[PDB]
Amino acid sequence: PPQLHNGLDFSAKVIQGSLDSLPQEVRKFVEGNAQLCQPEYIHICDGSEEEYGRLLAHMQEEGVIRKLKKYDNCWLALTDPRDVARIESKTVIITQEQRDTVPIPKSGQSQLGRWMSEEDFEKAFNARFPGCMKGRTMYVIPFSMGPLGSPLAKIGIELTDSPYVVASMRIMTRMGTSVLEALGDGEFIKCLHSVGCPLPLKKPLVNNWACNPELTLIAHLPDRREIISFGSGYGGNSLLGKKCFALRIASRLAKEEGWLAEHMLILGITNPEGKKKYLAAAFPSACGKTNLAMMNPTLPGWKVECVGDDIAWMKFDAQGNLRAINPENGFFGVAPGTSVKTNPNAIKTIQKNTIFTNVAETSDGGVYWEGIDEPLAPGVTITSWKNKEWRPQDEEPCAHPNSRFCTPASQCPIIDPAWESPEGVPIEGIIFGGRRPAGVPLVYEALSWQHGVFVGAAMRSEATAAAEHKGKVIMHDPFAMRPFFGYNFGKYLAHWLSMAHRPAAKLPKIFHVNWFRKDKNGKFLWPGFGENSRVLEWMFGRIEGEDSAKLTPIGYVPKEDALNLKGLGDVNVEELFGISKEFWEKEVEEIDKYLEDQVNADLPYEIERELRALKQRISQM
Numbered sequence: 015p016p017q018l019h020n021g022l023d024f025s026a027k028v029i030q031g032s033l034d035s036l037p038q039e040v041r042k043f044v045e046g047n048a049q050l051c052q053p054e055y056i057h058i059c060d061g062s063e064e065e066y067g068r069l070l071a072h073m074q075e076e077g078v079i080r081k082l083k084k085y086d087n088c089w090l091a092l093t094d095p096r097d098v099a100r101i102e103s104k105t106v107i108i109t110q111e112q113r114d115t116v117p118i119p120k121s122g123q124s125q126l127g128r129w130m131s132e133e134d135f136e137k138a139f140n141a142r143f144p145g146c147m148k149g150r151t152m153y154v155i156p157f158s159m160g161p162l163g164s165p166l167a168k169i170g171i172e173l174t175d176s177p178y179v180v181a182s183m184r185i186m187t188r189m190g191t192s193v194l195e196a197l198g199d200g201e202f203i204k205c206l207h208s209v210g211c212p213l214p215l216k217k218p219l220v221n222n223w224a225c226n227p228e229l230t231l232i233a234h235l236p237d238r239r240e241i242i243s244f245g246s247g248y249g250g251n252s253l254l255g256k257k258c259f260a261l262r263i264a265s266r267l268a269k270e271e272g273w274l275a276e277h278m279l280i281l282g283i284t285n286p287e288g289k290k291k292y293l294a295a296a297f298p299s300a301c302g303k304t305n306l307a308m309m310n311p312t313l314p315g316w317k318v319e320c321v322g323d324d325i326a327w328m329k330f331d332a333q334g335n336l337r338a339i340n341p342e343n344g345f346f347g348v349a350p351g352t353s354v355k356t357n358p359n360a361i362k363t364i365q366k367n368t369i370f371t372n373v374a375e376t377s378d379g380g381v382y383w384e385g386i387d388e389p390l391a392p393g394v395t396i397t398s399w400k401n402k403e404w405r406p407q408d409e410e411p412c413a414h415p416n417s418r419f420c421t422p423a424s425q426c427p428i429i430d431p432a433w434e435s436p437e438g439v440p441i442e443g444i445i446f447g448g449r450r451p452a453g454v455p456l457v458y459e460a461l462s463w464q465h466g467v468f469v470g471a472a473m474r475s476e477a478t479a480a481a482e483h484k485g486k487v488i489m490h491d492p493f494a495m496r497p498f499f500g501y502n503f504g505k506y507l508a509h510w511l512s513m514a515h516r517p518a519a520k521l522p523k524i525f526h527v528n529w530f531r532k533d534k535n536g537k538f539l540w541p542g543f544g545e546n547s548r549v550l551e552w553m554f555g556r557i558e559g560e561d562s563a564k565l566t567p568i569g570y571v572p573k574e575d576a577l578n579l580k581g582l583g584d585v586n587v588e589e590l591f592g593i594s595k596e597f598w599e600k601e602v603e604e605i606d607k608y609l610e611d612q613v614n615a616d617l618p619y620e621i622e623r624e625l626r627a628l629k630q631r632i633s634q635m
């Protein structure tokens with residue numbers, strides 16, 4: 015025990031587990047950060063049910079969460095209204111050179127990520143972390159992204175002072191002692207989180223929800239294999255395995271190592287004949303992945319099974335199959351809109367062992383939100399997400415627009431049998447899409463891999479409530495990755511294009527969808543949800559080589575009568591499927607200006623070529 019005093023030994027403060035049990039480098043990480051942050055206690059998480067019960071009890075007793083008595087082991091957290099979603103403007107990546115992280119925009123102000131210099135980050139770090147956990151417990155969370163012990167899994171350690179983060183990580187990752195045993199003396203991603211409210215409190219606590227909005231900063235240091243997040247408890251900012259690791263850090267590793275880390279669901283779809291295919295889909299935040307990934311198809315005999323709803327790690331095997339795995343262990347899903355009619359499999363999943371954040375509570379201990387589509391007995395009352403009595407005729411919603419459920423994937427009734435298979439599932443189609451109220455038809459198919467990459471690059475979508483963006487501003491969200499690129503977007507495009515030069519590659523067919531086109535009065539032209547199975551059927555047939563497509567300037571679309579619209583006789587097909595020369599001339603000009611300004615010297619030639627080819631096809635209309 016080599017030391018002149020007690021070294022950096024924090025053993026006296028350990029209230030679960032043992033520092034002696036930890037791999038050497040894990041111990042160093044814990045003790046170095048204990049020295050810095052000065053927690054009152056250290057809790058080494060074991061991931062056991064016993065621990066989870068006591069953690070929930072502790073939070074309940076502290077008033078941080080409430081038990082929802084109507085359900086089996088479900089809980090409700092209500093946050094400070096300042097800490098409710100991601101904050102892109104406070105999310106940064108540190109590298110030696112800015113251009114490695116983001117292209118330099120011609121006009122000023124990049125929209126493909128925020129870079130911070132090493133020097134500026136050190137100052138930011140020193141202004142936040144020293145002493146930040148005083149009076150609190152530092153929890154040590156050993157977690158695996160991907161199935162335990164898989165050669166493709168990646169392990170992290172997250173230190174946090176938030177028991178809400180511990181509970182949510184238990185759901186969203188594989189966590190506990192088994193992860194430490196699989197880790198051994200291997201490398202792990204170093205993840206440090208604090209709510210940034212050391213005791214005694216310097217500022218008023220709102221709704222018993224510790225946070226520091228003024229100093230909120232979600233930082234990524236890929237060259238140090240570190241993620242450092244301060245001031246926010248909201249899951250996208252605090253669950254460091256999810257967006258921070260499994261997209262931002264992992265996307266750059268993937269570029270270096272020949273794979274892909276993407277904001278994509280993975281689903282398996284089986285037709286009435288029993289033939290099954292796996293598909294991946296990238297839609298922006300709050301644009302429909304969870305609803306698609308566990309859809310109940312309206313077409314009789316069709317079945318969808320869920321591999322993952324949010325993040326995909328994909329790599330070509332030796333046979334050329336693009337194999338995908340879900341690195342998550344749960345769903346962190348948008349609550350509003352979820353009903354028996356729109357997402358019955360989510361309703362089944364969230365009946366037990368689920369943590370809800372910022373939803374409303376009924377007087378009989380249930381959950382409520384806009385679009386839940388379940389009448390309450392007369393006399394039953396509602397407490398809004400703001401902890402105030404609420405009525406249906408009220409101006410503001412009962413649930414926050416970005417309220418979430420956090421639920422075990424193992425509870426999904428149609429979880430796919432291969433959802434934890436270490437080798438992944440073979441992807442036969444990749445689907446892009448987002449919210450476009452005008453101009454973009456229900457579905458089209460890219461003409462080639464290069465055209466498909468351009469389609470991903472050109473994605474635009476109405477702003478949602480998943481981050482700080484207000485109104486329904488149509489924003490660029492290439493590959494649904496705008497908030498999540500771990501490195502220069504132009505390099506990411508080159509990396510995707512390079513997949514076509516892999517010998518033997520079985521390149522997935524690429525499609526683009528729009529569930530959200532609206533008529534003149536602002537009403538949806540397409541009902542969506544389970545009806546989207548009709549679009550998946552067409553995709554399935556196209557992968558099988560069916561002659562069910564008509565060429566248009568934007569790509570292939572369904573032939574007349576090719577889509578099954580039985581039961582949707584009132585859909586206005588000409589409006590929904592319409593392609594206007596005027597709209598598309600404007601669209602290509604907008605994309606050209608965006609790529610030139612935002613990507614410029616980093617833009618691959620093949621992307622510029624696809625833009626010109628699209629413009630040329632439009633000119634022949």
Ligand SMILES: Nc1nc2c(ncn2[C@@H]2O[C@H](COP(=O)(O)OP(=O)(O)OP(=O)(O)O)[C@@H](O)[C@H]2O)c(=O)[nH]1
Pocket residue numbers: 297298299300301302303304305306323324346347348349350351352356480529538541542543546
């Ligand atoms: N009109 C319509 N709304 C949909 C459709 N699919 C999903 N939604 C709604 O869009 C919102 C977000 O859908 P999700 O499936 O949770 O979005 P996501 O892509 O999983 O979002 P993140 O988890 O933030 O990445 C919810 O309110 C849904 O009810 C659809 O087909 N049509």
Ligand SMILES: O=C([O-])C(=O)[O-]
Pocket residue numbers: 100250298299300324346480481
């Ligand atoms: O939380 C999410 O999944 C998001 O914002 O994409």
Ligand SMILES: [Mn+2]
Pocket residue numbers: 277298299300324
């Ligand atoms: Mn997401």
Ligand SMILES: [Mn+2]
Pocket residue numbers: 303304323324346347348
């Ligand atoms: Mn989702």
Ligand code: NA
Pocket residue numbers: 077078079091092093094221222223
């Ligand atoms: Na609260």
